[PDB]
Nucleic acid binder design. Sequence first.
DNA 1: AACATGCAAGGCTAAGGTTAGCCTAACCTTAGCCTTGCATGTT
DNA 2: TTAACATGCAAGGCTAAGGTTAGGCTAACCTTAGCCTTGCATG
Lengths: 120, 120, 120, 120
Amino acid sequence: KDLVDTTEMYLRTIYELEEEGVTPLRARIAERLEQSGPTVSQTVARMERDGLVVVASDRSLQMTPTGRTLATAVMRKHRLAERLLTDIIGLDINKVHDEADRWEHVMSDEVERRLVKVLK
Amino acid sequence: KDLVDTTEMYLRTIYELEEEGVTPLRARIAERLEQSGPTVSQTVARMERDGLVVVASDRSLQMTPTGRTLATAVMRKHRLAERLLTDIIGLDINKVHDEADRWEHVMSDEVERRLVKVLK
Amino acid sequence: KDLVDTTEMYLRTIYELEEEGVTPLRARIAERLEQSGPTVSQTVARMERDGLVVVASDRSLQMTPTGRTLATAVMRKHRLAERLLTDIIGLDINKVHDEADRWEHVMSDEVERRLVKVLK
Amino acid sequence: KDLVDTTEMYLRTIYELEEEGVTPLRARIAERLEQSGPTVSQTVARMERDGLVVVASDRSLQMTPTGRTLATAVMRKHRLAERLLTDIIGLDINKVHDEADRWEHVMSDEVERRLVKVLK
DNA sequence: AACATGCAAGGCTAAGGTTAGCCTAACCTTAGCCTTGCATGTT
DNA sequence: TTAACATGCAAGGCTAAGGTTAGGCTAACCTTAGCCTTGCATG
Ligand code: NI
Ligand code: NI
Ligand code: NI
Ligand code: NI
Ligand code: NI
Ligand code: NI
Ligand code: NI
Ligand code: NI
């Protein structure tokens, strides 16, 4: 719905946290994604069950090999979308990332590869 | 979501059905979106509740002004999307409808306008 | 529903038909279990899918070994119920079969054996 | 079919819950009949629709006259079955409640009465 | 005396629904529960 | 004339508990409509 796909926006949010140094904590995801505290815990749990993440003893989020995989793919697509929007389509900059947060969840690998060549 | 957005695809199915000049019946949506007979009626219901369609006395689906407005909208983005993918991106033509059936539900109005221009 | 357990009541009706040497046909089950002809064919279909029956070239029902097994167990419990109600409980003789038509479907094998000692 | 009769088992659960002094909450039915949260809400609603219960303002389940009448009946046949099984049929005392949990939904008043008499 | 049509059962299938039951993924609110870091007035 | 001092307690981060919507599904049933293959009964 809002997130088009939750697991992906959760995986991306975690990855983005690690990227900026911040400890990947559920409380963070909650605030970053505008969702309630127990909602996040529940979903993360669901994801842990699905073998995407793991909660550590220090309560930090640890992505599994499969987790990262999916994570870097959404990140990838996010950029690739953001580019296509700003250049080829030429959408208002202040609206770009907003658009890409959605397209990122519905862009196939096929197009992904295709698009990397196209942009250039 | 398999349909990304269920309501937009139920509307597009009705509209397209109408173009083909085939009475729009739930059993028809059923075949096309591959869902159980019960699931379709249950959904058309929520839909009729939010006033997007009306189930006639002869069981045909009648889109309300709102329903028709959205339908055209979705339908319009579908084409602009199918286009964007073939013209500038260049993706295997055989995989273009499917991709566009996903993009149709995440494309913003602004991106719809900026796209009618860019493409020539 | 009314039949408590359709598959069981179908298997028994077939077996009973065979017992009285009458071609076991769907139109025959419809007659006895008082259900619409399309309903009967659909259900039998499901049963065939479940490896309980097979519909021959002449369109007669043919219980598979797993099917006859089920069939005899139902039939067997039906008798043990009809007896328990008449001998021990002493329920009105007319109302006896109707009651047993239900208990037949909800009596464990466990209880079956026991009742075969007590009852006689 | 897992409950044999879904409505009769909801009443009984509400009823038994009241005997134990536990507030009859939908969540309680879920725990006990082991069903999904959303499944219990539907079923109760359907029940409320046919006026067998009323969801209080503090969310408690209020059995209506009709509902309680049924409840008791069920509750009554449960015990009669439980005895009949353990007293004249002599079945594993351990496996008696379960067996009774099924018989309760298929026992006639006609038989209920005959049973109270034929058990000294 | 053998023919013919003349179809009507009888037995299904094709279509399109409906109810009752059940389920998961996501979200929410309202209540506590542990740690921690320390402000604050105290010896 | 301030180091030295528990320790008082609100954040911060969760879990607990009970729901809700949206979206899906299967088993069982129904009515209508149409199709096909014989068992006769009338010219
Ligand atoms: Ni970005
Ligand atoms: Ni996103
Ligand atoms: Ni198309
Ligand atoms: Ni679509
Ligand atoms: Ni009998
Ligand atoms: Ni029966
Ligand atoms: Ni008991
Ligand atoms: Ni029961």
